[PDB]
Structure formats: C-alpha cells, structure tokens
C-alpha cells in the first residue's frame, strides 16, 4: 500500500509529523511541502519502499506533484 | 546602437539565416524572429498600446515572449515580466502598481482573471488558437507603425522584487542600464557569433538579461530551458550537450543539483566555455569540485541587486585546498564605480566592514511610479575589502532574505501570515545555509494552539509564490523585541533548540 507509506513519510519528513491536512491529492510543490532540494529525498524513499529504480526521463514534475502521481508512477514502472 | 532593440537588428543584418532563439516547439532564425517581432508590433499598435505604457508578460518563456519583448522595445512600450506561477492576488498588486493596460497570458489563467481586480484590463492569449483573445485573431489591417524618438535612458522594462509591505517593488530599468551590463559582459567574456547561450532563469529575474540580450547582441543563439527539463538535473545536463551550450548562467543551487544528480562532474560537458554564477555564496566545498572538473572554463562569481544588475564580478582562479570562506565578489563591473561606506558616509579602510555603494550606468532609474534614484545606490549588502582590493560579501543587516537565490523580504511573508485569522503576530527568519536553508515562521496564535501547517501553507499559497511559503512554523506566546519593537533574532536560538530536541529522539 504505497499511499499509506508516502502520506505518512511526507508528514514526518516535511510537516514535522502532522498528517492533519495531507492526502493523496494535495499539491506538494504549490504548497512548498516539497521543495526543489528535497525532490530526491522523495525519490530515495520511493526506491527503497517500492523497490523500483527511478529513471531520468521520469523525474518529471507531473509524476511528483501529488502522492496520487507518485503511486501511479510505481504502478506504471512495475508494469 | 544606444537602444536595446537596435542591437538585434544589427545582428539580424549580419546573420539573417542564423538561429536566434530556441524553445521546445520552435527554433527561429534571426529573419523568422524578425517576422514574429513585426507581428507583435502590429498587434500592439492595433490595440492602441502607446509609448510609455506598461504590459504584463504572465506566461512561461517561449520564442513568442522574446518577440514580444523586442516588439515592445521598438514601440517604447515598457514590458513587465510576471512569474507565471505567481498567484493572481500578487499579479493584482503588480497590475495596480504598474497600471498595465494589457496582460499577455495563457488561456488557462483567463478564468482566474475574470474574478480578479484586473478583469477590466485587456488581455490576450498566447497559447491557445481557440480563444477569442488569441493574439493572432486581433485584426492588424489598419495598424500603422509610428516613428519614435527613444532615448537610451528611457524606461525599457520593470523587474518587480519582493516588497517589505507586501506590495512588490518595481525596478525600473533603462536602455542604458541594460546595455552597460550587456556590453560589459560581452567584452569581458568575449561572447562570439554562433555561440549557444542557455537561458535557465525565468524572464522575471535579471539573469535572463544576459542570456537573451547578450545572445542577440553578438549574433548568437539563446536556448530557452523549459520547466520540464529544468526539473531533472540529468536532463538539464543533457540539455547542455544536445544544444551545444557554451555559456551558462545560474544561481549556485542549480549547479549543485546538476553536480549531485546530473553527472555534471563525471559526464563532462565539454562545450561549456563560460560558466557564470550569481545571486548567492557558492559553498566552497562544491565550487572546489566544479572547478576541478572544469579546470579550463572561464568561471566567475557575479554580484549585485536587481537595482544594479551585476555591479561586481570576480574571475575564479584556483580554489585553495584550505579555503573555507566563499570566493570574493571581486571588483566593480558594468562600467560602475564601487566602494564600501561607513555609516558616517566616508570610505572604509581596507579590512573595515561597510555597505557596498554603487555609482554608474547600471544603477536603476528608480522604483516605478516612485521618485527617481539620485546619486550612488546604497545596496544594503555588507562587504569588506581584502588587501588585494577585492571585496568579500558578508551578508545583510536588513530584512531581505535569500533562499536558494530567491530574494525574499521578511515583510512580504509576514504580511501574508499575519492576515490569517488566527495569527496575531509574526516573524520570519531563515535557518540553515545553502540547500539546507529553511524558511521559518515564528507566530503568535490568537486562540488555543491548533494551527495547521497545511492550512497556513494554503493561506500563503493564495498570496505568495511557492518559494515564499514557510517550510516550518514555530508557535510561541510572545515575540521577543528590543525596546523599540525590533525582533530580537534570538528566535534563531529558539528554532535551533526545537530542531535539536527532535534529533535527540
Ligand atoms: P527551488 O524551485 O527552491 O530551486 C530551483 C531554483 C532554480 C534554485 C530556484 O530556487 C530559483 O529559480 N532560484 C532563483 C534565483 C534566481 O533565479 N535569481 C535571482 C536573481 S539574483 C540577483 C538579484 S536579486 O535582487 O534577486 N538578489 C540580490 C541580492 O542577492 C545577493 N547576492 C547577489 N549576488 C550574490 C553573490 N554573487 N553572492 C552572494 N550574494 C549575492 C545580495 O544580497 C544581493 O543584494 C541577481 C544576481 C546578479 C544580478 N542580480
């Protein structure tokens, strides 16, 4: 269940553990939850938790805009 | 040749079949850009936009935007670049300050403008041919192009900066302001015909002045970096190779992402000839690695506020193994004179800390719709001169902040935060250096202690660009002030105590 591990991870890493308003559809960059410089700290969590290697062509902003985008990526990158 | 728009005409006359500007969709020869410029000149006339009037460019960079700029310059029309990702409310404040008579934007963002305070300002759509407002649908049949008397110190464009009150401040820049910098850069770095410039910075930051206007000044090519490619550091560095980029200009943070994840130090980009950085301290550990991989590249630290563009520059030689402090900012640039001032107004001795003061041709006309700048410009940047004459940057004393090169007034953010119904008082400060810098909000809550960091970020997102939204918040019952209301800056001790407490567990 990828959504649960990302919603949880994002709150502790970037919201100091406050999961109050975060969900799979909240825009992470428009809200400065995830900045320019924490983009790979997220890709690094998706390589360990999901166990799939992320490519350069797929480090697109649309894939990481939301949790629903990142989960769709791992489903996509799995088959 | 004392006017900006005359520079590309000179290059067009020399190099008509040479590639002038490149984006994702199109790649325009100088002749094709000329034709495009003439369409926008005809458009602006057909709309009755006259000499002196302001227009907002609220759209992502493209060849059309470059053509718009040249067209507006030819008509003495002052163009005003606005962050396409900026919220309508901030666009509102800028439209009011400039009194723009025209907004150029995508069709997507017309909808937000209908409910805005600039619903009555004329708008044209740049992207979607299906819009009635599509710029090409404006009938240019009866348009007639006038002949104008434009002086080199007439206002050319306005670049808005963060404002201490919440209203952005417009740096009003003349033809002479831009050309002093452009000519200085072209002579110092010997930009040549047919070189390829990368335009990484958005058009509303003055780094794009070099990327675009130096390229059109020497008959070279400007390659516009799209946001989709700017976001994969591995794609940024592949961008350099595919377009055979030879001049690069960015804040250090961009170069560091390309080093960390773009293979910039291992997959050597050997077409690079000049590698300029500006806007912030380039961590010397990382500059050391960059200089070792690109040992034969012209590599330079450029300095200055938007109010002056680059007023000081330093050619980077070697990086001493033992160096801990950032490289100097150097000596005066762009035809200016530079010195460090004591508060008494006198010139500092070597070693004395003082405020950088700039006098010369890149000094702005002044803030738009505000009284003209007279005399030397006090920058607010504290500096110290080394025995060798080069200046070193020390930081600021005022409330201007920097996060990864982005200029942020504490008061702009505080104003958005204080407007929240539950926030009583607010202080903003940056904690951490470089890529670890974080924007903190220190607040006083009216009731309870229940303030959602996400609710605070949505509230900020309605007023501020994303990089101005607070990363972290700290709620306490009182803000520490000196006897006359100045925030004690001991909040940094309070924040450091919070962060350390979390590491302890
Ligand atoms: P992400 O979305 O958080 O990361 C992505 C990225 C690209 C890093 C993003 O954050 C970004 O786009 N960065 C924006 C930075 C940028 O594009 N440039 C802004 C122009 S910087 C400066 C004008 S200024 O007024 O904005 N800043 C003036 C101010 O800056 C300080 N300063 C200038 N130059 C230096 C140097 N060399 N060293 C230290 N400090 C420096 C001074 O305090 C100065 O007063 C430009 C730079 C050249 C001319 N003006």
The DSSP result for B22-38, as a single string, is: E-SS-EEEHHHHHHHHH
| Boundaries of domain holding B504 | 398-505
Q: What kind and span of H or E run contains B382?
A: strand B377-385
Residue B105 phi/psi, 5° resolution?
-160, 175
Which residue from B231, B460, B461 is facing A61, i.e. has the nearest CB? B231
Domain end marker among B344, B364, B397: B397
CB contact under 8 A, A40 and B457: no
Residues B33, B134 share a domain: yes
Q: Which of A35, A43, A67 to mutate to test binding with chain B, by most B CBs within 10 Å of its CB?
A: A35
Q: Which residues in B lie closer than 8 A to residue A14 (C-beta atoms)?
A: 471
Report strand pairing: B472-475 vs B298-303: unpaired
Rounded distance, CA B392 to CA B98, Å? Answer: 36
Q: Which of A15, A40, A56 to mutate to test binding with chain B, by most B CBs within 10 Å of its CB?
A: A56
Residues B402, B386 share a domain: no
CB contact under 8 A, A31 and B235: no
Helix (H, G, I), strand (E, B) or coil at A3: helix
Residue B85 phi/psi, 5° resolution?
-90, 10
Resolution in angstroms comes to 2.5
3-state helix, strand, coil split of chain A in percent (to 5) is 55, 0, 45
Show the tokens assigned to B387. 């025995």
Is residue B211 within 8 Å of B220, Cβ to Cβ?
Answer: no
Residues B343, B258 share a domain: yes
Rounded distance, CA B304 to CA B330, Å? Answer: 11
Nearest residue (by CA) to ligand 1, atom 4, is A36
How many other CB atoms sit within 10 Å of the CB of residue B344? 5
Please tell me the distance between residue B368's alpha carbon and the centre of ligand 1 in angstroms: 21
Rounded distance, CA B210 to CA B188, Å? Answer: 13
Residues B255, B144 share a domain: yes
Nearest residue in A to B435, CA atom = A37
Please tell me the distance between residue B188's alpha carbon and the centre of ligand 1 in angstroms: 21
Domain total in chain B: 2
Q: Candidates B279, B301, B468: which one to mutate for ligand 1, based on the most atoms within 8 Å of Cβ? A: B279
Rounded distance, CA B233 to CA B262, Å? Answer: 5
Domain total in chain A: 1
Rounded distance, CA B19 to CA B16, Å? Answer: 8
Helix (H, G, I), strand (E, B) or coil at B122: strand
Angstrom CA distances, B499 to A16, B86, B179, B455, B472, stand at: 10, 31, 47, 22, 11
Residues B390, B409 share a domain: no
How many other CB atoms sit within 10 Å of the CB of residue B14? 12
Which residue from A26, A30, A59 is facing B232, i.e. has the nearest CB? A59
Q: Please identify which residue in the block is written with the tokens 């009755």.
A: B48
The alpha-carbon radius of gyration of chain B (Å, integer) is 23
Domain end marker among B397, B415, B443: B397
| Boundaries of domain holding A4 | 1-79
Rounded distance, CA A54 to CA A32, Å? Answer: 23
Show the tokens assigned to A49. 């938790």
Angstrom CA distances, B205 to B231, B405, B473, stand at: 18, 10, 28
Domain end marker among B347, B368, B397: B397
What kind of experiment solved this structure? X-ray
Residue count of chain B: 505
Rounded distance, CA B385 to CA B329, Å? Answer: 10
Angle between helices A39-49 and A2-14 (to 10 degrees): 140
Residues B427, B351 share a domain: no
Rounded distance, CA A79 to CA A72, Å? Answer: 11
Helix (H, G, I), strand (E, B) or coil at B9: helix
Residues B404, B273 share a domain: no
Show the tokens assigned to B449. 């202690």
Angle between helices A67-78 and A39-49 (to 10 degrees): 50
């Amino acid at each position: 269940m990828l959504e649960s591990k990302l919603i949880n991870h994002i709150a502790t890493q970037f919201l100091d553990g406050e999961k109050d308003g975060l969900d799979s559809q909240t825009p992470l960059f428009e809200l400065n939850i995830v900045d320019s410089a924490a983009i790979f700290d997220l890709v690094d969590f998706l390589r360990q938790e999901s166990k799939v290697s992320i490519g350069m062509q797929e480090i697109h902003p649309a894939n990481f805009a939301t949790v629903q985008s990142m989960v769709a990526l791992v489903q996509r990158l799995k088959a | 040749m004392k006017l900006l728009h005359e520079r590309m005409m000179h290059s067009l006359a020399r190099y008509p079949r040479q590639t002038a500007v490149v984006d994702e969709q199109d790649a325009l020869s100088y002749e094709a850009l000329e034709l495009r410029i003439r369409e926008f000149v005809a458009m602006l006339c057909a709309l009755g936009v006259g000499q002196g009037q302001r227009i907002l460019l609220w759209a992502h960079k493209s060849v059309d935007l470059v053509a718009v700029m040249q067209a507006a310059l030819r008509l003495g029309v002052v163009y005003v670049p606005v962050d396409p990702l900026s919220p309508v409310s901030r666009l509102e404040k800028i439209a009011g300050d400039s009194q723009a008579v025209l907004v150029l934007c995508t069709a997507a963002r017309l909808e937000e403008l209908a409910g805005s305070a600039l619903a009555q300002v004329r708008s044209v759509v740049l992207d979607d041919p299906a819009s009635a407002g599509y710029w090409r649908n404006i009938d240019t049949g009866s348009s007639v192009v006038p002949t104008l008397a434009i002086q080199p110190d007439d206002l050319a464009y306005i670049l808005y900066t963060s404002g201490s009150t919440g209203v952005p401040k417009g740096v009003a820049l003349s033809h002479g302001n831009a050309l002093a910098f452009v000519d200085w850069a072209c002579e110092r770095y010997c930009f040549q015909p047919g070189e390829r410039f990368a335009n990484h910075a958005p058009l509303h930051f003055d780094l794009s002045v070099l990327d675009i206007y130096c390229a059109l000044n020497v008959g070279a090519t400007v390659c516009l970096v799209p946001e989709s490619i700017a976001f994969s550091p591995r794609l940024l560095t592949d961008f350099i190779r595919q377009h055979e980029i030879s001049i690069w200009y960015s804040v250090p943070s961009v170069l560091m992402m390309m080093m960390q994840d773009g293979d910039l130090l291992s997959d050597i980009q050997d077409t690079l000839r000049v590698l300029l950085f500006a806007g912030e301290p380039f961590p010397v550990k990382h500059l050391r690695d960059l200089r070792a991989a690109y040992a034969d590249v012209r590599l330079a630290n450029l300095f200055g506020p938007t109010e002056t563009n680059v007023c000081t520059a330093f050619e980077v030689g070697a990086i001493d193994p033992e160096r801990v402090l950032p490289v100097p900012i150097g000596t005066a640039a762009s035809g200016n004179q530079v010195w460090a001032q004591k508060p008494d107004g006198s010139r500092c001795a070597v070693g004395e800390e003082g405020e950088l003061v700039v006098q010369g041709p890149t000094v702005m006309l002044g803030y738009f719709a505000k009284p003209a700048q007279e005399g030397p410009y006090k920058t607010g940047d504290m500096v110290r001169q080394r025995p060798d004459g080069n200046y070193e940057y020390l930081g600021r004393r005022d409330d201007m902040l920097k996060v990864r090169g982005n200029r942020i007034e504490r008061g702009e953010v505080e104003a958005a935060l204080l407007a929240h119904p539950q926030v009583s008082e607010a202080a903003v400060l940056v904690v951490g250096e470089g890529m670890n810098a974080q924007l903190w909000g220190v607040l006083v809550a009216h009731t309870r202690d229940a303030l959602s960091l996400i609710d605070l970020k949505r509230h900020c997102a309605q007023r501020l660009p994303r990089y101005m939204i607070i990363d972290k918040v700290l709620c306490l019952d009182a803000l520490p002030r000196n006897a006359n209301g100045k925030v004690d800056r001991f909040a940094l001790a309070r924040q450091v105590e919070g962060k350390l407490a979390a590491a302890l567990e």
